[PDB]
Design a binder for this molecule. Sequence first.
Ligand code: CLA
Ligand code: CLA
Ligand code: CLA
Ligand SMILES: CC1=C(/C=C/C(C)=C\C=C/C(C)=C/C=C/C=C(C)/C=C/C=C(C)/C=C/C2=C(C)CCCC2(C)C)C(C)(C)CCC1
Ligand SMILES: CC1=C(C/C=C(\C)CCC[C@H](C)CCC[C@H](C)CCCC(C)C)C(=O)c2ccccc2C1=O
Lengths: 217, 41, 740, 226, 83
Amino acid sequence: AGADRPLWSPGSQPPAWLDGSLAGDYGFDPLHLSEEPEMRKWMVQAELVHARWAMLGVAGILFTSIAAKNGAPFPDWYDAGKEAIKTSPAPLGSLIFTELLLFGWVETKRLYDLRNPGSQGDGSFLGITDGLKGKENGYPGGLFDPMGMSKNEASFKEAKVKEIKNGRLAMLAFVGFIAQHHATHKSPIDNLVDHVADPFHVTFATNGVSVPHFTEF
Amino acid sequence: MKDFTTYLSTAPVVGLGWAIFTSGLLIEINRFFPDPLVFSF
Amino acid sequence: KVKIAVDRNPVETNFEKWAKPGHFSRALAKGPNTTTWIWNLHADAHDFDNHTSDLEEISRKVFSAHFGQLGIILIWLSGMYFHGARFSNYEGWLSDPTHIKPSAQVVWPIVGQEILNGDVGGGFQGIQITSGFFQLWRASGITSELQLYSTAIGGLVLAAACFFAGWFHYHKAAPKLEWFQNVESMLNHHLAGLLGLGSLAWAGHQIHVSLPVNKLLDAGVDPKEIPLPHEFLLNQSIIADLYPSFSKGLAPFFTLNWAEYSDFLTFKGGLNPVTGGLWLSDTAHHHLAIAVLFLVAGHQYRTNWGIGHSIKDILESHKGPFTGNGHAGLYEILTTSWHAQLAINLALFGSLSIIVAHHMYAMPPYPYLATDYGTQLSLFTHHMWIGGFCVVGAGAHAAIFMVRDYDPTNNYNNLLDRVIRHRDAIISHLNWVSIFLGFHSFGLYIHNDTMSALGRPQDMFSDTAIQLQPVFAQWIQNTHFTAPQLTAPNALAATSLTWGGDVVAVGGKVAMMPIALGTSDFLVHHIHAFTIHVTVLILLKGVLFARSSRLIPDKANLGFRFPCDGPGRGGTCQVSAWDHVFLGLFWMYNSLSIVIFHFSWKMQSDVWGTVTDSGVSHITGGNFAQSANTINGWLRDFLWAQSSQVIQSYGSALSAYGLMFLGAHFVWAFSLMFLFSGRGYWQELIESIVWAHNKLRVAPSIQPRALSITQGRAVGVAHYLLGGIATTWSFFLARIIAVG
Amino acid sequence: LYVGSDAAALKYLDGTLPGDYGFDPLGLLDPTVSNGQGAGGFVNPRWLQYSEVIHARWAMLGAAGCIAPEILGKAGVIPAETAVDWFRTGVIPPAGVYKDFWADPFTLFFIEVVAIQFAELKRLQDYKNPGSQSRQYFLGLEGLFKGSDNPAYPGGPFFNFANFGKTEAEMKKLKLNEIKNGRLAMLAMFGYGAQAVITGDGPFDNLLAHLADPTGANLITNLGGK
Amino acid sequence: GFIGSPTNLIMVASTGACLFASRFGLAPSVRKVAQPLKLADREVIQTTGDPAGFTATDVLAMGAAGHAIGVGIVLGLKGIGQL
Ligand code: CLA
Ligand code: CLA
Ligand code: CLA
Ligand SMILES: CC1=C(/C=C/C(C)=C\C=C/C(C)=C/C=C/C=C(C)/C=C/C=C(C)/C=C/C2=C(C)CCCC2(C)C)C(C)(C)CCC1
Ligand SMILES: CC1=C(C/C=C(\C)CCC[C@H](C)CCC[C@H](C)CCCC(C)C)C(=O)c2ccccc2C1=O
C-alpha cells in the first residue's frame, strides 16, 4: 500500500504527495496536480464521481447496444436523445430542469460533505444521524452501502482499488466510444463484431478517418 | 501548484480573467439579443 | 580551442519566482510600495545588464530570449498559414488573381461588424489583406489549402520545438561565456549554415517545386489539374517535358557544362509579362549564386584547424598613420559588450530593411504582386518603418554601450577615443550641414509657395520655370538602362523597369513602367536627405555626449536613462542620451512619413493606373510634376485630393479604416499631454484624488504616483508614434483599396 | 593502429572504448563539454556511446534486412513477389508498397510502435535508473532485465544467454568487433540510401552493375558523367 | 568531367598544383602562418603518416580551392570562347 508499489512507469520517481495511500495510486502525475491536501481531496472526489458516472453510462450504452444487436428495438448510443424526447411523455426543457432540481440536493450535499466531513449526518435531512456520514473522503457509505461488505478494512481497500481501476477502464471505454463512433458511425458492438470478424483488415486504419489518405498510393 | 496558483493570483492574470469573462458575457448577450437600444422587457 | 562549454542545470524550473513579480533586481525585490514600482517592473524586465554583473548569465538570458522571440515569430507564421488554409479564398484567387482581391481575415457577425466582410470575389467574404501572402504562396508553388494546413502545423511544431529549446538551453544546458565568445565560429556557421545553406535549400525548392508550378500556372492550366510537387520530385518525365535539361539528370552540373542549365536557370532580367513578377529561374540562379558565395565566405575565419583569418589580427593590422591605433580595442569591445553588437545588428538590419523596401517596390519578386497596388504600398511602408525603428534603436543601444560598457583603459588612442576626442567638431559640422540642407530645401519649398501665392509661376522652382533637374540621377538611370547593352551583355533586358524601357501591364493594370525624375523629385530627395541628416545629428549627439559634455562633465555617473540634472546651469532637462533618442524618434517618424508620402504620390501619379488603347491613365493623372513643388500641393493635391476614400468609407467594408483613422488621430492628440506638461502638476492632482479616496476610506495601500519624467516622455513618444503610424496606415490602405 | 586520429583529441580520451581510434576532429567526447550535475545536454560521453552502439545495432539489422530479401530472391530461396526492394516494401509508398500482406501497413505500424515503445521506454527507464526494470513486476521476466553497470551492455539471462566472453580480453575483442561491424553497416546503410535515391534499385543490383561494368556503372556514370 | 576532356585536364592540373603548393611552402596551410611570408606553426592535427605539415583538413581545404579555381577557369575560358 505504498513505497515499493507498481507505478505508471517502472523506474520513475513517484511524487512526494502521492505516497500510495489512495486507491489506484500509481504515482502518475506529469502536471504535478493535487499537491495540496484540499486539492487532492477535490481531485479524489471528482475522479470518484466521474468514475461512477462513466461506469454507469458505459454499462447502459453496452446493454442497449447488445440488446439492439440481439434484436430489441434500441437506438444507437449516439443521437439517442432525439428519438428519446420524440417518444418521451416529458418534453425537453422540463425534463432537463427536473433532472437539475433532483440533482441539486445530492450534489450540494456531496459538496458540503466534502468541505465539512460528517456534517450531513446530524439529523438535518429527515432526522438521519448515524447515516449520511462520509466514511472516507470520496467514499460516503451509510445508506449508499446497504449491504456491509465495506466494514472490513482490507475488503474495503480491495473494493476501492477494484472500483477505481474499473472506473479508469470505463473512462477510456467512453472515450473510445466517442472516437470510433465519430470514425465509423456505428455502434460499439458493431465495431466489436467487425473487429472479431476480420481482425487482419478491420481496424482503426481502414475506417477512412484517424489516418488521413491524400495520395491514395 | 500553489506557486502557480499565486502566479495566477497576480493582478494581470486576474485582470485578464475578468476581461475574458466580461467580454464573453457582453458578446453572448449581444449575439443572442441582436442590437437592442431601449429597455422594453 | 573552439569547443562546446555547457553547464548542466544551473537554474531549477520552479514556479516560486513566478509568484514574486519583482525578483530580477534587488531594488524591486523588496516589494512594491508605490505605483511607479509597477512600471519599473515592466521597464527593467529585459535590462539584463542591470540585474547581474556576470556576462555569462546575461548571455544565457539573451540566448533564451532569442529562442522565445523565434518561437513567437514561428507561432505568428503558423497562424498566418492557418488563416490562409481555412479562412481564405486562396484557391479562388489562384483561378483569377486579377479579379479576386486577396482575403484572409474573416470577422464574426456580432454587432454589425459583418459589413467588414466585403465582396472580395470568388464567392468569399472577408477583409482584403495587404500582406501579399497570396503572392508569396503562389511563388512557393502552394496550390491547395492542404499544403497551407501542413505548413501551419509544421510551424506550430517548430515553434513548440524552439520554445522547448529555449527552456532547455537556459534551464537544463546553459552555454558558458567561452561558448558565446567564439565569434569566429559564430560568423563561420552563420555565413555557411544560416545564410548559405538556407539559400541553397530555397534555391533547390525553387528549382524542383516552385518553377514547374509557376510555369504551369502561367500556362493557364487549372491549378487542380497541376501535378503535385512530389510528382515533379520523383518522376522525371514531367520535369523533362517542362525542361529538357532535366533529362540529363545532374550531368551538366558535375561535368561543368552549366550552360545546358540555361533553360531553367535564366538571366532574363526584367518583369515576366504573364504575371508582372520576377522570373523564377532568375531567382533560382540568384539564390544558388548567393548560396555559393556564402559557403565560400563561411570558410574565412580560423576556428580549430589552423587555416583561416583572425578577427583580432585583422582589426589590429588595419591601422593607418592618420588614425593612431587603428581598430585596436574593437575586438575586445564587441566580444564583451552585448549593446555594441546590438547597435551594429540594429543598424545593419534597419538599413537592409530599407534596401528591401526599395528593391521590392522596384522589382516585385512575386507573381501578380505589382498589379496589387495595395500590397506593394503596404509592404514598402511596413519595411520602411521597421527599418527606421531598427536604425533608431541602433543609436539607442550604441548610447547604452557608451554609458555602460565603455572602458577608458582599453581605449587610449584607438578610433573610438579619437571620435570622442573630436565629437564637438563632428556635431558642429553635422549641424551646419543639416541647417544648410533644411534651408536650401524647405526654404525652396516656401519660395515656391510664396511665388505661387504672389502670382509668379515663372519665379518658381518647378519643371517649367527654373529647371533644377536631377542630372546625376537621370544619368545613372540612362546608364543602367544601357547596362544590358554594353556592360552586362548576357542580360536579356534591363535589371528593372524603373530605369527605362516599355510598360508592363497585367490584366489591364500597369505592373511596372519607367519613372521620370523632375525638379519635384530632386526637391523631395533633398528633403529626405536633410531629414535623415538631422536625425543622424540628434542620435550621434546622443551617442557621443552620453558620457560627458561641457554642460555636464559627469553624465556617465548619472546613467544612460535619467530625466535631468535639475534646473541648474539654466536647466538640464532632456540632457540624457535616452532623451536624445526620444527626440530623434519624432524626426525619424517625420522623415519616413515624408518618404512614404513621396512614394505613394509618385507611384500613384507616374507608375500605377490602368492601361487602355490610348495609353496609360494614371490614378492621379500625373500631377506630381506640377503639384509636388509646393507645400500647398501636398496639402490639396495629395492629402485633400486623396483621403476622400477614408472619410466616405462609412457604410462599406472600408469603414474600419475610417474608424482606425479616427482612433489614430485620437491617440496622436492624446500623446501631446505626455509630451508637454511635466510631473508636479499630475503629482498634485493625484494628491487631490488621494484625498478624495481617503475621505471615502478607499485609498489604496499601494501609493499612486505620477509617471516619471522619463516614463512620461516614453509614453508620449510611444502614443505619438502609434497615432501617426496608424493614421498613415489607415489613410494609405483605404485610399489604395478604394481607388486601386 | 589509430585510423586518422586527430591530434589534441587524445588529451581527454584514453583507451577504454571498444573502437577508440582517436578520431574526433570537432570534439564531442571531452568531459569539459556539458559538465555539471543532473540531466544536462545531449552531448555527454555516456549518451554518445549509448547512441553510437544503438545506431550500430540498428544499422546492422537494417543492412541484414536490406541484403537478405534481394539476395535470397535472386536465387530460389525467396519467391519473386516477396523479393521486392527494401524501400518498395511499404516504408515509402511513393517508392512502392507491398499490397499482398497479412495486415494493413498502418496496422503493422501501430503494432510495431506499441511494441517498440514498450521496449525503448523500458530501455530509457533503465538507462536513467539502472536495474529499475527488474524491480517492478512486468510479466515475470523481470530477472531477465537485470542490466549491468554499462547501459550499452546489459547482459543477463536473455540479452546474453550464450554468456560469451568470460575473460576481459574476449569482452574487449567482442565489443571492438561489434562496434566495427556496426560502423561498417552504418556506412553501408548510408550507401544504400544514396543508391536508392540515385539509381532507384536494390543495393545488390548496383553491386552487380559495378561488377559487370566498372567504368560503365559507377558513381561517375550514375549522375551522368563519363 | 569526361576523361580526356580539356576541362578535366586543366582542373586536375590546377588541383595538383594547389596540392604541390601546399606541400612545399607557397600556398598557406595549417602549418603556415603570417601575412607577408609563411612561418612554421604547431602541427595541430596528426598527419597520419604524411611527412611535414600535411593533414586531412589541409587536403580538404586545398582540394576545395583547386576545384574552385578549376571551375572558375573553365567558365572563364568558356565565356571567352576558349577551352
Ligand atoms: C550552421 C549552424 C548554425 C545555424 C544554422 C544557426 C542558426 C541560428 N543561430 Mg546560431 N550558432 C552556431 C551555429 C548555427 N546557428 C554556432 C556554432 C554558435 C556558437 C559559436 C552559434 C551561436 C549563436 C548565438 C549566440 C545566437 C545564435 C542564434 C541563431 C539564430 C539566428 C536567428 C535567425 O536567423 O533565425 C533563423 C531561424 C530559423 C531558420 C528557424 C529554424 C531554426 C532551427 C530550429 C535551427 C536549426 C539549426 C540548429 C543550429 C541545428 C543545431 C541544433 C540541434 C542540436 C537541434 C538561428 C536559428 C541566435 C539565437 O539564439 O536565436 C534563437 C543567437 O543569439 N547562434
Ligand atoms: C538543397 C537543394 C536541393 C535538393 C534537396 C535537391 C534534390 C534533388 N534534385 Mg536537385 N538541384 C539542386 C539542388 C537540390 N536538389 C541545384 C542547386 C541544382 C542545380 C541546377 C539541381 C539540379 C537538378 C537536376 C538537373 C535534377 C535534380 C534532381 C534531384 C533529385 C536527385 C537527388 C540526387 O541524386 O542527389 C544525390 C542524392 C543522394 C546521394 C541521396 C542522399 C543520401 C541519402 C539521404 C542517405 C540516406 C541514408 C539513411 C541513413 C538510410 C535511410 C533511412 C531509412 C532506412 C529510415 C532530388 C530530388 C534530379 C531529379 O529530379 O531526378 C530524380 C534531376 O534531374 N536536381
Ligand atoms: C515646421 C516647423 C519646424 C521648423 C521650421 C524647424 C526648424 C528647425 N529645427 Mg526643428 N523641430 C520641429 C519643428 C520645426 N523645426 C518639431 C516639431 C520638433 C520636435 C520633434 C523639432 C525638433 C528639432 C530638433 C531635435 C532639432 C531641430 C533642428 C532644427 C533646425 C534645423 C535647421 C534647418 O535645417 O532648417 C533651416 C530652417 C528653416 C528652413 C526654417 C524655415 C523658415 C524659412 C524658410 C526661413 C526664412 C524665414 C524668413 C524668410 C526670414 C524672416 C526674417 C524676419 C522677418 C524674422 C531649425 C532651427 C535641429 C537644429 O538645431 O539644427 C540642426 C535639431 O537638432 N528641431
Ligand atoms: C601523393 C600521395 C598519395 C595520394 C593522394 C591523393 C591523390 C589525394 C587526392 C585528394 C583529392 C583529389 C582531394 C580533392 C578534394 C576536393 C574537394 C574538397 C573539392 C570540392 C568540393 C566541393 C564541395 C565543391 C564545391 C563547389 C561547387 C559545387 C560550386 C562552386 C565552386 C566549388 C568548386 C567550391 C597517396 C595517399 C596515394 C600516397 C601518399 C602521398
Ligand atoms: C497625464 C500625465 C500623467 C498622469 C498619468 C498617469 C498617472 C498614468 C495613468 C495610467 C492608467 C492608470 C492606465 C490604465 C487606465 C485604465 C484604468 C485602464 C483601462 C480601463 C478599461 C479597460 C475599462 C503623468 O504622470 C505624466 C508624467 C510625466 C509627463 C506627462 C504626464 C502626463 O501627461
